[PDB]
Amino acid sequence: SMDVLEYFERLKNRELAFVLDDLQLSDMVTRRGFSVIPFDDFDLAREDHPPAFVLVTRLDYHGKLMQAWETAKGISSHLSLAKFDTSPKSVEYSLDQLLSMDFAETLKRRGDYYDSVASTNRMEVVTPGAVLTCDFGNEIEIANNDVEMQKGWLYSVAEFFETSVINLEADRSSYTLNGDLCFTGLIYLCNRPDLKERASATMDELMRMSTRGRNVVSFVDNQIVRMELGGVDMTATLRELIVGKEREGSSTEFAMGCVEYPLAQDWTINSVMNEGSHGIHVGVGMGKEIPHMDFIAKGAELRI
Ligand SMILES: [Zn+2]
Ligand SMILES: [Zn+2]
């Protein structure tokens, strides 16, 4: 059972089997010094298989990987970009971001942030013109927090870049949000091709707006009640895409990014890498009938 830092040092040193699902992306990966093997040729089931990094670009392959979880018997994480933007531009950006960052530095902030959620009942997020409060319940649901990677467990890399609390069982099974959050940009995640066809165009509009000025999201009783992007109120567009669907405005994720990205971020690119941006991000939607939006505030400071 390999240690997480042991895993990523090998990733930095190109000592991992790079499993790839779209071979048209092979040249960009091999140009970065990795030996690539197609997805359908790597035996995740064999226990002696070498420690692997899987890049899933396609939703059908994202499903094939999920089919192999209970059968997996070795060491593997995977960067799942199938549910975000899967263009070469997004893929090159995601890999450049991952391969440039300081992993050990990221994992300790992550460890420290979990040392903060467990102890405290209240968190205050201060952004330039806003303050957000988070009241953790007595029973919080969290994303996998293993620091030594277990055998047969398919780790999503992203969960190594953030400390994430989520309201999965019910609307407020873990935490409640009241107040405002001024954020930098956003990403959005869709689990189905049906949803991605409907919302992607709109969500990309919202992302580009986020570059044009003040971004602010407001919560009352853990329900999103206002969404300002580029200094303009878009709450009407928010309601059209959440009303009458799933839990509507219920916040679904409260998480803390732990990555000091050395390379410039691009907030027009819907890549999961941006969710790990050092700071705070809030989640709305489950990616089923509403895209799971993540309003990400970078330089945000925390208060207990
Ligand atoms: Zn998150
Ligand atoms: Zn999220």
Author numbering: 0 to 303
The authors write:
CgnB was recalcitrant to crystallization until a slight molar excess of CgnA was added prior to crystallization trials. We determined the CgnB structure to 2.3 Å resolution but observed no electron density for CgnA, so the peptide may simply have acted as an additive to promote crystallization. Curiously, CgnB contained a dinuclear metal centre that was partially occupied. The binding sites comprised CgnB residues Glu161, Glu252 (shared between Zn2+ 1 and 2), Glu274 and His280 (Zn2+ 1) and His291 and Asp293 (Zn2+ 2). As expected for homologous proteins, the Cα root-mean-square deviation (r.m.s.d.) between the structures of CgnB and CgnE was only 1.2 Å over 284 residues. The aminopeptidases form an extensive dimer interface, and the residues involved in its formation are largely missing in CgnB and CgnE, which rationalizes their monomeric state in the crystals. The leader peptide is enriched with positively charged amino acids, and both CgnB and CgnE show a large, strongly negatively charged patch near the possible binding site. Hydroxylation at the Tyr20 Cβ position allows CgnB to catalyse an elimination reaction via its bound Zn2+ (or Co2+) ions, which results in a double bond between the Tyr20 Cα and Cβ atoms, creating a conjugated amine. The CgnE homologue CgnB on the other hand appears to possess catalytic activity.
Crocagins (1 and 2)24 are very small, intriguing RiPPs that possess a tetracyclic ring system, which consists of a pyrroloindoline fused to a tetrahydropyrimidinone moiety. Here we use in vitro experiments to demonstrate that three proteins, CgnB, CgnC and CgnE, are sufficient for the production of the hallmark tetracyclic crocagin core from the precursor peptide CgnA. We further show that the hydrolase CgnD liberates the crocagin core scaffold, which is subsequently N-methylated by CgnL. The crystal structures of the homologues CgnB and CgnE reveal them to be the founding members of a peptide-binding protein family and allow us to rationalize their distinct functions.
